């Protein structure tokens, strides 16, 4: 049936534009951060705890577990 009418609604162009820009920018730095975290976890992730060797005093950053924290 050919009875299509005009739906008067406010301009939603600017809302979609802002949402697209914010998503793009968050994603722009966000995706690389996630990929790098995944690669670090898989390949170099988690240093296991061990007793300190006699006569050896460790560095201040060797008392932490996660490589990014170190």
């Amino acid at each position: 049936h050919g009875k299509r009418l005009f739906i008067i609604k406010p301009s939603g162009f600017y809302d979609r534009r802002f949402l697209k820009l914010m998503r793009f920018y968050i994603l722009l730095t966000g995706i690389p951060v996630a990929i790098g975290i995944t690669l670090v976890n898989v390949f170099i992730g988690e240093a296991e705890l061990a007793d300190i060797p006699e006569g050896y005093v460790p560095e201040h950053w060797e008392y932490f577990k996660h490589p990014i924290s170190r």
Partner: protein, 40 residues
Amino acid sequence: SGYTPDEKLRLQQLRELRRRWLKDQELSPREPVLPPRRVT
């Protein structure tokens, strides 16, 4: 009771304008001009 003649006339003109305006709200066959572009 009933409309005064001026009331009748104003109602007639207003209702004809309103019907014309409402009829102008309909969409032509090409009215939603969509711009195409892509990237069990």
